[PDB]
Amino acid sequence: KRYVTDRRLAETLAQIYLGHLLLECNPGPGILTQALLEAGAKVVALESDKTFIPHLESLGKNLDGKLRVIHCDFFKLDPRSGGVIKPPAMSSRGLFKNLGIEAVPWTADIPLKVVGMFPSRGEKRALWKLAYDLYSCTSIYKFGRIEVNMFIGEKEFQKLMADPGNPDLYHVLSVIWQLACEIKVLHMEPGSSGKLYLIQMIPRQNLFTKNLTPMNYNIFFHLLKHCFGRRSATVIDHLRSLTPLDARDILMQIGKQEDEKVVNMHPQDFKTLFETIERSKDCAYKWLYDETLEDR
Template sequence: MCCKHLHTCLTLLVANLGHTSLYNSLLLLLNNFPRTWPSAFFFGVMWPSPLYELCRPDLGKLIFLHLNWCPGVLTRTLLNAGARVVALESDKAFLPDLQSLENSLHGQLEVVYCDFFRLDPLGCGSMKPPAMYSEKLFENLGILAVPWTADVPVKIIGFLPQKKERNILWKLIFVMYERSSIFRYGRIELNMFVSEKEYKVLTAKPGELRSYQALSVLWQTACEIQLLHMEPWSSFLTNSKTRGLAIPKSMLLPNDHLCLVRMTPRRNLFTDGMTTTNSSTFFLMIKQCLAKRKSKLIDRLNSWSPDSGSKLLRELEIPENIITGNLYPEEYRRLFEAMEHSKEFSQSWLYDEVLENTRNINF
């Protein structure tokens, strides 16, 4: 990655972090730059001074949790801006340098041996670092839970590991609807570098049957999604032998860029109609509806409660001939809440299977 392109990404990132609404937030910076990518990555040592000037004075009121960024570029930028940084490092080889830096900064930097993407694994018992329970991590960092409707208490920035992107997106959205793991502490904002193909799925619109999936509906229902920056892969990644792209093109969706995406959980995600108690039912309903995006919605409804679909769709003013891939996320939510209050659907097999399927969702 040349200085120019890293400057662009970090300028946008730090400028956004300096927004006044973030002054009282705790920012968890998960800069786990992919170290397994080809060695043709290269970084300059010095970074343009305008990057530092964009860090507003109030940035010093935030705490940044920094995760596995090889050269520590953003870490140093934030430290120079006066921010308190918590570095989550999953590779022991990088701990000595970080700890040496920690000792020289008099409390401004804290280093924790932890892998963020291995927080809260299924099961229970003793945990061997770098795996960790989020409860222990947040407790050690002094992070307290706040009501869901409160301001964002924690902001996370990082790279989704390329080989596990889809799995991690499923896991994050699942625990968000559960309000478990990190979301037990409130509306945790995610600022993630993701591949273009996954960004296209997250933001797909009804009718885009190739990209509009269950993941699209679940994320759009739960979060406001904003593209902060899009950078061509060719700007900073090549294969050292062939000089071609090391990230293969997607056969079905565009995948020519790396995207910095902000996902902010909605204040009104949980209401009387959508709670942590029934959200797993909504989760399962969306997965089943979007499994076949060209199938008629009324057929799916009637399979859950025979001859009840037509009445429900009329009440919601949804066309009876609509296919599942043409329904907007907000319409799926209205449909779910109507089903929750419907006597016809109260005994549906969908609800009977929720408890069995909740923990068997494929991540």
């Protein structure tokens, strides 16, 4: 996987993350773990690979920093469907209970911070998994607006931050994550394998509204996947397969013309579109949701 192995980078990250409890994912050799402890951090190591645990546990006995090491793969917590039957893969409810982490309301301040690096070849998969957890307020997000800082490769970073201003890279996860979080680059590291961006993902206090909730976000995801399935088409073309309501009237309410294209819609335009349909009255039904669309 990806590991912080450069001492100078580790010292830089420690100042970023300190300047509250820290969950470090896949510390590996523990160069960042040691830098965090030297800097005075309180760290819980979630290490997926057992072979690194002896040295990590050696670090906590001898350094002036309370360290707890758990054999836990953060990216396998609370499988979206499955039986929780894997030693390294666990439930966040059981982990957070053992760690004494208490849930707080969505509106409250950040209870906890998670830091690490996305897997080099599972970035989209991980972003989808976290997005489902976030919008549903399950897994770690059952406990509040968890701050997540993750290194990501440049290609997926540029796609995540794209919008109508850069249409060629604009896709479903761009909308999902820009609505969910204010995303900021905390560091950029040039590695032999390509540029890595450390992005800070703090869930927005105002993500959820009267009409976008943890109970109906899946309909919103369906709208987005449907639209970006034919990204060059008009929004009205897609709406005719999404809602029985008058698609032209809907678009007018959000200030868009009939010929508006999917790729010209900003993330907030999609949110207002979804809320506008949800708002409508005297309707036996607002959506034609009858199919499961793949995560792309």
